[PDB]
CSV table of C-alpha atoms and ligand atoms in Angstrom, one decimal:
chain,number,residue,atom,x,y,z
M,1,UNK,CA,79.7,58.2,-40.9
M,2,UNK,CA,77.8,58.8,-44.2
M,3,UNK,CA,78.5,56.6,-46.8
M,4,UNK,CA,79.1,57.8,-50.7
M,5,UNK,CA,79.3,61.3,-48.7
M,6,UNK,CA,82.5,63.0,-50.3
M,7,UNK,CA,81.8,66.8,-49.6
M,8,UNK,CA,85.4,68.7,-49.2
M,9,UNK,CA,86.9,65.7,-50.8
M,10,UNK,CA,85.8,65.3,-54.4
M,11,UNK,CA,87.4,63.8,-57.4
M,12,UNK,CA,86.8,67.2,-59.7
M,13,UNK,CA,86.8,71.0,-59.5
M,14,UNK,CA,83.4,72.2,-60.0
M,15,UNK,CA,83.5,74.1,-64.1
M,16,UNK,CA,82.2,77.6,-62.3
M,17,UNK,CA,83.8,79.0,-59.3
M,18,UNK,CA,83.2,82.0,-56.7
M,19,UNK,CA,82.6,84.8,-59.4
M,20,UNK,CA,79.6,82.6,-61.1
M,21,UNK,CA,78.5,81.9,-57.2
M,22,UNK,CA,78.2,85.9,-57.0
M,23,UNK,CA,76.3,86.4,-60.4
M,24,UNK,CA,74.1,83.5,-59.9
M,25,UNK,CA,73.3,84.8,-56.1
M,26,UNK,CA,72.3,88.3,-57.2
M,27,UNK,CA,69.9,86.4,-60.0
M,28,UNK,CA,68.5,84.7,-57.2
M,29,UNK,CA,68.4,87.7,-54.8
M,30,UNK,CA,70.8,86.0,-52.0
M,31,UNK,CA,72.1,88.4,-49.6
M,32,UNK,CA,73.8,88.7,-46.4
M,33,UNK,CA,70.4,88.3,-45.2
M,34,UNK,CA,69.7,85.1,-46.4
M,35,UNK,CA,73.1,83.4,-45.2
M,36,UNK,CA,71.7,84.3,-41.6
M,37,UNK,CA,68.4,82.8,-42.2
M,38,UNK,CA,69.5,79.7,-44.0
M,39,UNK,CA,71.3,78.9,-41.1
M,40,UNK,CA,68.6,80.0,-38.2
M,41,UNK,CA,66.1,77.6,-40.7
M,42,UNK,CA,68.8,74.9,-39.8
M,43,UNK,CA,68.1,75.6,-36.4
M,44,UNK,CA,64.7,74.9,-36.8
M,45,UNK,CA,64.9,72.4,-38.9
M,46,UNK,CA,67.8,70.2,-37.4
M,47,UNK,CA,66.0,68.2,-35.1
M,48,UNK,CA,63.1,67.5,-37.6
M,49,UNK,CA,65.1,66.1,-40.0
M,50,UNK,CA,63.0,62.5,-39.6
M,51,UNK,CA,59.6,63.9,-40.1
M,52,UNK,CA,61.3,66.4,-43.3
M,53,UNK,CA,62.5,62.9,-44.5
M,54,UNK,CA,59.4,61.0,-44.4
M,55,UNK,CA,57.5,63.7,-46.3
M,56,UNK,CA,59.4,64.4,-48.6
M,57,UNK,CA,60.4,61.4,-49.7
M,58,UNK,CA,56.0,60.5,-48.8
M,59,UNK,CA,55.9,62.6,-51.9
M,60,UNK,CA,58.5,61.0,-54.0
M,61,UNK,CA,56.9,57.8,-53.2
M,62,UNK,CA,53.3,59.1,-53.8
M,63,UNK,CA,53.6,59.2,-57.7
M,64,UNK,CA,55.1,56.3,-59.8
M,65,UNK,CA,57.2,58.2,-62.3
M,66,UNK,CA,58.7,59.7,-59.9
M,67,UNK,CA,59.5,56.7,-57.1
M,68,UNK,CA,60.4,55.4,-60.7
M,69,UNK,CA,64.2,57.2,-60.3
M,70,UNK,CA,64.7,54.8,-57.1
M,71,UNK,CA,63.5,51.7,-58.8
M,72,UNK,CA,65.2,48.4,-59.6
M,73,UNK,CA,64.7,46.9,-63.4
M,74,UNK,CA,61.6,44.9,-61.9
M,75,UNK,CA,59.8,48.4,-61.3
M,76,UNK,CA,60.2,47.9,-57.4
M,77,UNK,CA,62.0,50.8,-55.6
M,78,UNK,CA,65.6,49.5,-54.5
M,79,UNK,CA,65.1,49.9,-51.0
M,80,UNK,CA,68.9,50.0,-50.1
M,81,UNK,CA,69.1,52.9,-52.7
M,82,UNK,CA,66.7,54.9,-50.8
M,83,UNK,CA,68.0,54.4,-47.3
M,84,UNK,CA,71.4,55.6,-48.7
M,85,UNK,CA,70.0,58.5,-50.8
M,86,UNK,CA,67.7,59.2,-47.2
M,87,UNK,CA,71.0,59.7,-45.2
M,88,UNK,CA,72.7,62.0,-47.5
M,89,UNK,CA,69.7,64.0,-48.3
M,90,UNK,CA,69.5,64.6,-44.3
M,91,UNK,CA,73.1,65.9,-44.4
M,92,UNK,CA,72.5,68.7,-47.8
M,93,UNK,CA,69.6,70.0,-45.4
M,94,UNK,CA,72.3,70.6,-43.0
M,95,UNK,CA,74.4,71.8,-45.1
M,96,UNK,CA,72.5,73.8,-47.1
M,97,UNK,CA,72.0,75.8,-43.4
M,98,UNK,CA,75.5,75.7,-42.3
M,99,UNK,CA,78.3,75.5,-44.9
M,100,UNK,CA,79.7,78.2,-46.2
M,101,UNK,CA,78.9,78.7,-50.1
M,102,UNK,CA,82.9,78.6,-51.2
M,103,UNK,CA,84.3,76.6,-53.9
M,104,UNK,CA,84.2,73.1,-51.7
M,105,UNK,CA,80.5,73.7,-51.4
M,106,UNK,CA,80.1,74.8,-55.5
M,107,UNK,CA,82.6,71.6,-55.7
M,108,UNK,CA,80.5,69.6,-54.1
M,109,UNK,CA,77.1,71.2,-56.2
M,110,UNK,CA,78.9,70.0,-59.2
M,111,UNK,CA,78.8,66.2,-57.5
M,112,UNK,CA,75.4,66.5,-56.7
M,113,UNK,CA,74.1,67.3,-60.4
M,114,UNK,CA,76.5,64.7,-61.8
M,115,UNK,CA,74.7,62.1,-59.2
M,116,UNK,CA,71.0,62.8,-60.2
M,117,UNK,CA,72.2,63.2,-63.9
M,118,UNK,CA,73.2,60.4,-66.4
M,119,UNK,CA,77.1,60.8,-65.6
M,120,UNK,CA,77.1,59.4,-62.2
M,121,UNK,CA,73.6,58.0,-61.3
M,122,UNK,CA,73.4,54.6,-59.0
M,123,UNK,CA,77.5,55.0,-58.9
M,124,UNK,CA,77.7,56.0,-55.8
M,125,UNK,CA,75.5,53.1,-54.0
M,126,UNK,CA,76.5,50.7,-56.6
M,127,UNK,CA,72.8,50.1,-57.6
M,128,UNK,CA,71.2,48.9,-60.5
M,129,UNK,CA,68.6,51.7,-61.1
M,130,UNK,CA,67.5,53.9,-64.1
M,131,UNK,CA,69.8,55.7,-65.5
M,132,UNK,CA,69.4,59.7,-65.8
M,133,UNK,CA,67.1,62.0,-63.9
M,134,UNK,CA,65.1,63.8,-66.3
M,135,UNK,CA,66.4,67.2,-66.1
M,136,UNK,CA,62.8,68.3,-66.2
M,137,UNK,CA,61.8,67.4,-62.7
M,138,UNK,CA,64.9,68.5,-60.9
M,139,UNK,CA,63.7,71.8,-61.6
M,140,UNK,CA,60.3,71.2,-60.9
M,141,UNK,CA,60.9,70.0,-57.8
M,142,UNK,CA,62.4,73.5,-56.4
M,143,UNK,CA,58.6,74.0,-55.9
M,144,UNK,CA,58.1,70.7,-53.5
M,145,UNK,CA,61.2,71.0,-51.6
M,146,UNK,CA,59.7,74.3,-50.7
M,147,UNK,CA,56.3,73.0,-49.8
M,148,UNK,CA,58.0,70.4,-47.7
M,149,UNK,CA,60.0,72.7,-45.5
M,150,UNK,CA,57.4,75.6,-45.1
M,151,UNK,CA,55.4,73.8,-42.4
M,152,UNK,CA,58.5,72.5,-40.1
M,153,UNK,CA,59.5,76.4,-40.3
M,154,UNK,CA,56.8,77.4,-38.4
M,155,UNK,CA,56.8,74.7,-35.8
M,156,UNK,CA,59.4,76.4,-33.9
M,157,UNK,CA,57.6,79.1,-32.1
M,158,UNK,CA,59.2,81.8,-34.7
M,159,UNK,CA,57.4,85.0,-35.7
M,160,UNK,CA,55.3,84.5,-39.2
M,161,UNK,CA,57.9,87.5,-40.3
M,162,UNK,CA,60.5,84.6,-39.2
M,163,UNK,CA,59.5,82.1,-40.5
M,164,UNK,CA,58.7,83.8,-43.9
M,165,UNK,CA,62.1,85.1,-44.0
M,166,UNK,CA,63.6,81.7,-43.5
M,167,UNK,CA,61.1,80.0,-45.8
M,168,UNK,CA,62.2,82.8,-48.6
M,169,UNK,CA,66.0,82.2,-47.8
M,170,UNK,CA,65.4,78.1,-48.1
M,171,UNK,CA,63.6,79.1,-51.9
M,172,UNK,CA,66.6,81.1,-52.9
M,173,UNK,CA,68.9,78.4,-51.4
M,174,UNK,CA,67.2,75.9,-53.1
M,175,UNK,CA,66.8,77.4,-56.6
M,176,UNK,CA,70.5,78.4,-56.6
M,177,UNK,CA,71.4,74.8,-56.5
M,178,UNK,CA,69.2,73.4,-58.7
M,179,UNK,CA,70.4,75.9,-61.1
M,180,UNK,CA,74.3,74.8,-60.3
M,181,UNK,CA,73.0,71.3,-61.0
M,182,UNK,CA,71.9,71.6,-63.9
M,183,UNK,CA,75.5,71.4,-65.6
M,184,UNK,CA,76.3,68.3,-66.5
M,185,UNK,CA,72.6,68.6,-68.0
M,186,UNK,CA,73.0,71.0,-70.2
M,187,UNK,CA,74.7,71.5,-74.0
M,188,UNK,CA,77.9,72.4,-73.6
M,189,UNK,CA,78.2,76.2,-74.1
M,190,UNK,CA,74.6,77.2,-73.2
M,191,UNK,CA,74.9,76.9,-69.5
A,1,UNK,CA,48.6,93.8,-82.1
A,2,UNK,CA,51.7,92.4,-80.2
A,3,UNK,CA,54.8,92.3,-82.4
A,4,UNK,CA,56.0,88.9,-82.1
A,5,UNK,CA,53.5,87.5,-80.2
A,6,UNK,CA,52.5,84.1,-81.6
A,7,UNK,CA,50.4,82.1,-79.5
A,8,UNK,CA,48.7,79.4,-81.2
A,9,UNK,CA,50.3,80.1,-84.0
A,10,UNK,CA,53.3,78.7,-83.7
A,11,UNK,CA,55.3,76.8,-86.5
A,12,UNK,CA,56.6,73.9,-84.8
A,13,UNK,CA,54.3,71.5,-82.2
A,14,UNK,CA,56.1,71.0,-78.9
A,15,UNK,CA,58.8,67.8,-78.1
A,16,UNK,CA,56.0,67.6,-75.1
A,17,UNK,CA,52.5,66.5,-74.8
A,18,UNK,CA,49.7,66.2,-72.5
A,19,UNK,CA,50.7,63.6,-70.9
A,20,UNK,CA,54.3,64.6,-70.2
A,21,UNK,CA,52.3,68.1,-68.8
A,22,UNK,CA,50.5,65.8,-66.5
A,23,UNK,CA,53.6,64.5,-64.8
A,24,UNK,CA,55.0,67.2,-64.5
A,25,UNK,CA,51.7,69.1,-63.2
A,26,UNK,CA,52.2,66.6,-60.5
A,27,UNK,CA,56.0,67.2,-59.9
A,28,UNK,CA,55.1,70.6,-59.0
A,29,UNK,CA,52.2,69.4,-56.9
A,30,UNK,CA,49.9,71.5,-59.6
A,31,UNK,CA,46.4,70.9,-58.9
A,32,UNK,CA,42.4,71.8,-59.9
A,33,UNK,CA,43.0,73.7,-56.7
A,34,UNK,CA,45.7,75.7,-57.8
A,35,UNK,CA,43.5,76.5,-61.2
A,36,UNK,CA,41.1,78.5,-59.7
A,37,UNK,CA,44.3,80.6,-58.0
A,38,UNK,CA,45.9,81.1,-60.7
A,39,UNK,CA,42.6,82.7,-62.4
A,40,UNK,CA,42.0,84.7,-59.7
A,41,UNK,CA,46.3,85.6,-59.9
A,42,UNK,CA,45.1,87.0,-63.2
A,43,UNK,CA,42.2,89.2,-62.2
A,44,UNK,CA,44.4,90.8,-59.4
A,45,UNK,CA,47.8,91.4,-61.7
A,46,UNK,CA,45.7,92.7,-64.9
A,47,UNK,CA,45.4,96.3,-63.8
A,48,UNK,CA,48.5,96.3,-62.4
A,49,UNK,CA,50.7,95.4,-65.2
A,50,UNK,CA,52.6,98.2,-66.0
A,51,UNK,CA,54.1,98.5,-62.5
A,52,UNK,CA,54.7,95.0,-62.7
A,53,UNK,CA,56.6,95.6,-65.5
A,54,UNK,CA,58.5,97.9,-64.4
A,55,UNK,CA,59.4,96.4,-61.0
A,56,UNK,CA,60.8,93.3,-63.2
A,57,UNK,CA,62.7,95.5,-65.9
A,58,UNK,CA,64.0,97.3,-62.9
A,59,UNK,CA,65.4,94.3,-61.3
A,60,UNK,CA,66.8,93.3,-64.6
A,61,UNK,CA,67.8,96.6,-65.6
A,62,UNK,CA,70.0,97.1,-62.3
A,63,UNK,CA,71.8,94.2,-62.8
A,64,UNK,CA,74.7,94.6,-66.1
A,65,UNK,CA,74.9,90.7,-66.2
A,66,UNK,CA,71.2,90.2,-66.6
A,67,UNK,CA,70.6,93.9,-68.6
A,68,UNK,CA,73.5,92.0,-70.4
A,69,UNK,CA,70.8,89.8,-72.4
A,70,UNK,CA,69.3,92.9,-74.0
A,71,UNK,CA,72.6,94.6,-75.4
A,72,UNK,CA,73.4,95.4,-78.4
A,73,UNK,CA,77.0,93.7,-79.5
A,74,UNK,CA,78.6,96.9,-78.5
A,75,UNK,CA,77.1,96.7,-74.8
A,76,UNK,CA,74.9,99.2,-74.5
A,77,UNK,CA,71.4,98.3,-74.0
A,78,UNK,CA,68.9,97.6,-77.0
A,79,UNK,CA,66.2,99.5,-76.0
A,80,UNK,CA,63.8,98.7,-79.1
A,81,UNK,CA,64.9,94.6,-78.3
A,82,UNK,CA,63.5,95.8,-74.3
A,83,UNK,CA,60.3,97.8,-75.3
A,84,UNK,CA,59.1,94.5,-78.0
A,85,UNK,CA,60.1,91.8,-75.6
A,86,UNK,CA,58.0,94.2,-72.5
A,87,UNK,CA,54.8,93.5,-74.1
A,88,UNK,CA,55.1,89.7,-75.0
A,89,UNK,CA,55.6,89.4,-71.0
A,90,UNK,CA,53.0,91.9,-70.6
A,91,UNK,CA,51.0,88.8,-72.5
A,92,UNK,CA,52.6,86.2,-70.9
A,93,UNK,CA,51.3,87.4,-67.1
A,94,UNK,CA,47.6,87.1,-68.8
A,95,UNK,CA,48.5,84.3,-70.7
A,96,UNK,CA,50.1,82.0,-67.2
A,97,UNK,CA,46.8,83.3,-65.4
A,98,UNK,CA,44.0,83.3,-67.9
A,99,UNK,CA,44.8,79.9,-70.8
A,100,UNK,CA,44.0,76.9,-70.9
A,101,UNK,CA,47.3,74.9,-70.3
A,102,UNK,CA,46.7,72.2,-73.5
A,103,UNK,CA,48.4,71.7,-76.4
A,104,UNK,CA,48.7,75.2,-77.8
A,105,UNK,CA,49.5,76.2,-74.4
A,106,UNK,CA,52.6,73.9,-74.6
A,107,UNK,CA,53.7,74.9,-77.6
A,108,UNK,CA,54.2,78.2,-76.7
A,109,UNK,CA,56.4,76.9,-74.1
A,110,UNK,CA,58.4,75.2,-76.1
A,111,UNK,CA,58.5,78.7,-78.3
A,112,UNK,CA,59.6,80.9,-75.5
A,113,UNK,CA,62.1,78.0,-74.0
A,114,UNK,CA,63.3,78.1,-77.9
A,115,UNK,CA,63.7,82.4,-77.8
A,116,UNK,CA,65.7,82.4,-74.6
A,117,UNK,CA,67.8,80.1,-76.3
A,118,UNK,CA,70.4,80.6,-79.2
A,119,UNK,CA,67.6,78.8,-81.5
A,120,UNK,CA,65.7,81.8,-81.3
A,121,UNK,CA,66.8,84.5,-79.2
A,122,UNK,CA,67.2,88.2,-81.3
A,123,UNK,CA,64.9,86.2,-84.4
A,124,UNK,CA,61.5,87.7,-83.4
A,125,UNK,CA,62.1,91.2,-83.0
A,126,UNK,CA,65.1,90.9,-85.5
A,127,UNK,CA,67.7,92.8,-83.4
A,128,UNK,CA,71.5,92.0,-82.8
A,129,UNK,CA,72.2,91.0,-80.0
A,130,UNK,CA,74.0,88.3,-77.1
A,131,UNK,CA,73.4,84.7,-78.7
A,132,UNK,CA,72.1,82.4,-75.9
A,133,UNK,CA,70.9,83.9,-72.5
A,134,UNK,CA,72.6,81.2,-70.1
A,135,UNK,CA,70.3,78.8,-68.9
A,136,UNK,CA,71.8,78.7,-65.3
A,137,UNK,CA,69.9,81.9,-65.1
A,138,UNK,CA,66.9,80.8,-66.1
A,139,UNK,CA,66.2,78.6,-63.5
A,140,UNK,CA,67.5,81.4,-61.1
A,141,UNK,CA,64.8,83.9,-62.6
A,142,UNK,CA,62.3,81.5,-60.9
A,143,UNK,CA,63.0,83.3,-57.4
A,144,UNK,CA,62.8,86.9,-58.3
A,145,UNK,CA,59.7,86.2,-61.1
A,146,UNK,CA,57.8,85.1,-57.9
A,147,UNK,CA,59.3,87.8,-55.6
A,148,UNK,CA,57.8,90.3,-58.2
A,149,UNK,CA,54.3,89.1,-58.2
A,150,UNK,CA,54.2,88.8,-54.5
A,151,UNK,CA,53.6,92.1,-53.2
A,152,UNK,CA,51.0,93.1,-56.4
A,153,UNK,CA,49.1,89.8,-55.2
A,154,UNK,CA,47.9,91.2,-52.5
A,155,UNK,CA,46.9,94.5,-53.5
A,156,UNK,CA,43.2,93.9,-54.1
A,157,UNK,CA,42.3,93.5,-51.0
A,158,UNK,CA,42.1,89.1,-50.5
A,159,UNK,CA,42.6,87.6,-47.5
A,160,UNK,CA,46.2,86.6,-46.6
A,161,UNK,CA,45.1,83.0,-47.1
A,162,UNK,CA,43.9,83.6,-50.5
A,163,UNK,CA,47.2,85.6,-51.3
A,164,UNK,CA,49.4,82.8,-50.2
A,165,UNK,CA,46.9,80.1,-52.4
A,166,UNK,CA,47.9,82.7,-55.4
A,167,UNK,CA,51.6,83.2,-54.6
A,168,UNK,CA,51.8,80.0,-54.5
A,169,UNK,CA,50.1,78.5,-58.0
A,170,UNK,CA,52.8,81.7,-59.3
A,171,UNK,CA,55.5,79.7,-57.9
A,172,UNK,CA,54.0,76.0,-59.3
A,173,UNK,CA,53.2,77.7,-63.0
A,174,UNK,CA,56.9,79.5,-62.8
A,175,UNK,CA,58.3,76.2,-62.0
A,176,UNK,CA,56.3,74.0,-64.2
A,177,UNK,CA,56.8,76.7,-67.5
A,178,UNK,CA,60.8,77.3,-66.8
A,179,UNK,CA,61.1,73.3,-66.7
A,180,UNK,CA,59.7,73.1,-70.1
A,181,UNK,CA,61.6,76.1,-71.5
A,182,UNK,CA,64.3,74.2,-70.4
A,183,UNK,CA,63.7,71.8,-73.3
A,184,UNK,CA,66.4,73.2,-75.6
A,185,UNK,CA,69.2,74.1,-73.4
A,186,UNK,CA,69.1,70.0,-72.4
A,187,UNK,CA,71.2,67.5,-73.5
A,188,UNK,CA,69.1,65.8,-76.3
A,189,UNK,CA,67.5,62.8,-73.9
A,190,UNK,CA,67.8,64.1,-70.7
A,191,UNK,CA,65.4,66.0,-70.9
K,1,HEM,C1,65.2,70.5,-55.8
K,1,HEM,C2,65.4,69.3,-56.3
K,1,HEM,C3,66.2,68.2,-55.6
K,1,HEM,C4,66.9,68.3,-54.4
K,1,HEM,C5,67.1,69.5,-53.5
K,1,HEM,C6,67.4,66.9,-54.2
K,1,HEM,C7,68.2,66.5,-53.1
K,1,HEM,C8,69.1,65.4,-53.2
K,1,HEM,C9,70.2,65.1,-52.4
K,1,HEM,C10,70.7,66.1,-51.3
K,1,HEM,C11,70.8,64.0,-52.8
K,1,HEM,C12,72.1,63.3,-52.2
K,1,HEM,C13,73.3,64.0,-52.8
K,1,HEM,C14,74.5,63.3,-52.3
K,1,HEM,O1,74.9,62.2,-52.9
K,1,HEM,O2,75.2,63.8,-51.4
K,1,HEM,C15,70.0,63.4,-53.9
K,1,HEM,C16,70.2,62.3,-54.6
K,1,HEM,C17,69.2,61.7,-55.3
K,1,HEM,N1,68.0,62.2,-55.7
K,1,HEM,FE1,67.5,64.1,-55.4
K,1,HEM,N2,67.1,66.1,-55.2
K,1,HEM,C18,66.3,66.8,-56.1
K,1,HEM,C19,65.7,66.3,-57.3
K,1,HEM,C20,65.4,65.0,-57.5
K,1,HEM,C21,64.5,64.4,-58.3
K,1,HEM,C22,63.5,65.1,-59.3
K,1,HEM,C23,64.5,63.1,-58.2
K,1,HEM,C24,63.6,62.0,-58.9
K,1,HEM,C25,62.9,61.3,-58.1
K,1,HEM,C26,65.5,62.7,-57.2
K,1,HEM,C27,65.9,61.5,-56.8
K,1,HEM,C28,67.2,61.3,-56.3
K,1,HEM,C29,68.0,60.1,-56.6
K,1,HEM,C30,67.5,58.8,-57.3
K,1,HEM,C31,69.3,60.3,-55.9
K,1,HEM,C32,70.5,59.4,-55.8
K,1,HEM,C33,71.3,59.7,-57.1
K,1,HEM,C34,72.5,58.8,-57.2
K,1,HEM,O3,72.4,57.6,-57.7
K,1,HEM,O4,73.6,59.2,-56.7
K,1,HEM,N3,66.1,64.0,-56.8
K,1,HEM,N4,69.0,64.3,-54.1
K,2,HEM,C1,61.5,82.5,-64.8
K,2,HEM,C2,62.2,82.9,-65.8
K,2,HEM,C3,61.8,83.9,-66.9
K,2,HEM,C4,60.5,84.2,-67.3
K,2,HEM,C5,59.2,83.9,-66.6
K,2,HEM,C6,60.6,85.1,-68.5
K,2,HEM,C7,59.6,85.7,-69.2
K,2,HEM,C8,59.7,86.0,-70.6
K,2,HEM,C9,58.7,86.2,-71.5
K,2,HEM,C10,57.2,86.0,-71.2
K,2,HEM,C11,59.3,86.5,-72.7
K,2,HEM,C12,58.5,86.8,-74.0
K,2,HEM,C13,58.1,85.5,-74.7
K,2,HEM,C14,57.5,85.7,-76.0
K,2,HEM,O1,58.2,86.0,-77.0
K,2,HEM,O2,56.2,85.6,-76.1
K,2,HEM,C15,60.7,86.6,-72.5
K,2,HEM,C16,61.6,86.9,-73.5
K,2,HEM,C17,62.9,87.3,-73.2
K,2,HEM,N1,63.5,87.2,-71.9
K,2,HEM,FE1,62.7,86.2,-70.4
K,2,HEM,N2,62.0,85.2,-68.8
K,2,HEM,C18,62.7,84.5,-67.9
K,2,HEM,C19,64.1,84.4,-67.9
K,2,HEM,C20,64.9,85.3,-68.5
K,2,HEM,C21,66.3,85.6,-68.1
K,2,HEM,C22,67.1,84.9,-67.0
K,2,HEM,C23,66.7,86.6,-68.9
K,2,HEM,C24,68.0,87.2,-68.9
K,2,HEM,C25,68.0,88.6,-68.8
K,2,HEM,C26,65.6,86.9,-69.8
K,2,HEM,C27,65.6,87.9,-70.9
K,2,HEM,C28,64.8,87.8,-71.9
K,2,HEM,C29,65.1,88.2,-73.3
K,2,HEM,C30,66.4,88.8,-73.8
K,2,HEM,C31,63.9,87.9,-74.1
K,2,HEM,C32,63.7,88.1,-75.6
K,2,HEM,C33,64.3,86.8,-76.2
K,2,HEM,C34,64.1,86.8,-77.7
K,2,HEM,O3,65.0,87.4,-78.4
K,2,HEM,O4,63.1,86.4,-78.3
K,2,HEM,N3,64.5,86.1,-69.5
K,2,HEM,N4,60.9,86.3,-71.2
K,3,CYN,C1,66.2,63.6,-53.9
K,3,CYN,N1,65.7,63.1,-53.0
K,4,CYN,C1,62.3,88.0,-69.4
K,4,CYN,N1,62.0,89.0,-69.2
């Protein structure tokens, strides 16, 4: 249904497995607790998913070196490249609720970070975009996809102590990732 | 003084410049607004430091794959390489809250990116000790640095909006420093 979507049926193992998904979710203070408001933010964020979409990607389009990773050589964004991107984005905010975090999940983390990085960027859409991410806002934007999310939390009816506990589980959720994505990013051996 | 503590003195000028701190201010939707936050972040935190510290070295501390980074190459915990490094981040919570964020300011970025790296790490205090602290953590450390300031925010009696408006620039300054520390762990241009 969603094309250049290949979670559960990637081409390589991810290089950490269940044991570094254990260390990394203590650094990040993941819990039992999180994995059951992850997915209740789902719930609340499921049917919202075009609004979430149009501001975050509002955001994206708001300053030019960042609409820049979407753009064609001219300097125009690649329209077909962002309605592609747009549907699988919609999909990681499900999943990000409702998979469990096991190695086809970490399998497909690995995918992810080699898509916004130079090793697989504009493969998957067969575009002709620029080619690497600079590693230096994927992790500043851990702070806007948080930003984005907190006011669809609380849209919901949910109790601030709710929505707080979801927004807090999204952060962690969030941060984890970027940090799994950072991989193909970074020298081999200091990761 | 503070053993180790070089601000503004630093030997090398950072691979960033104002401009690159400009973008990436923006990535992290860092504004004039979040300024006067993060100043008043720093006149609530500064009398509460040393519980501050301790709450963080406590979450570090209780953790052996994070207490890890501070053992000595027979695994016991360097407690010397723990008591130097305590007062440099002692600085660093006036120094996010209370500087200027120009070029000085970024070349102590760059510094501390380079001492949680193998380029510097165990070179400052001149201890023995693990080579490289792994970089996936770093970007993990982003969640329980702001979960830590959090509570002590609120402390001085500010209204929950203003608490939020300083949790928040935490999280943006957090975000924005650990993307530049990320400078040497990062595949030279991908940065
Ligand atoms: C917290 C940080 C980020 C999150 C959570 C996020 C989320 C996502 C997701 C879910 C996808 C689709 C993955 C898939 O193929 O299934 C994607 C791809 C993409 N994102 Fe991001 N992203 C982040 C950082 C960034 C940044 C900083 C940019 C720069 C504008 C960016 C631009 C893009 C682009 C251009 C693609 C397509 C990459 C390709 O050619 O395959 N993303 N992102
Ligand atoms: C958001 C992430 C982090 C922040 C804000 C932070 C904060 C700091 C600060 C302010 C310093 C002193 C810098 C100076 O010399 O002036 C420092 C050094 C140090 N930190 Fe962190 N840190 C982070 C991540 C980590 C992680 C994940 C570890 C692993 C336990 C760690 C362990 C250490 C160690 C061992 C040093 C001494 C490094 C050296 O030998 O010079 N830090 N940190
Ligand atoms: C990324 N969107
Ligand atoms: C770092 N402490």
């Amino acid at each position: 249904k969603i094309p250049g979507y290949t979670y559960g049926e990637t081409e390589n193992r991810a290089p950490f497995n269940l044991e570094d998904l254990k260390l990394l979710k203590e650094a990040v203070m993941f819990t039992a607790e999180d994995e059951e408001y992850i997915q209740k933010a789902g719930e609340v964020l499921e049917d919202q998913v075009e609004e979430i979409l149009d501001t975050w990607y509002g955001f994206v389009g708001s300053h030019p070196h960042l609409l820049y990773y979407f753009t064609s050589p001219d300097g125009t964004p690649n329209e077909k490249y962002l309605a592609a991107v747009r549907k699988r984005y919609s999909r990681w905010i499900l999943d990000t609720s409702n998979r469990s975090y096991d190695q086809a999940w970490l399998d497909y983390q690995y995918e992810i970070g080699l898509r916004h990085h130079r090793t697989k960027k504009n493969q998957t859409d067969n575009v002709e975009s620029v080619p690497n991410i600079g590693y230096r806002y994927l992790v500043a934007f851990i702070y806007p996809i948080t930003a984005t999310m907190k006011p669809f939390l609380a849209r919901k009816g949910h109790t601030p102590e709710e929505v707080e506990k979801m927004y807090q589980a999204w952060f962690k959720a969030t941060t984890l990732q970027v940090a799994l994505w950072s991989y193909p990013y970074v020298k081999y051996g200091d990761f």
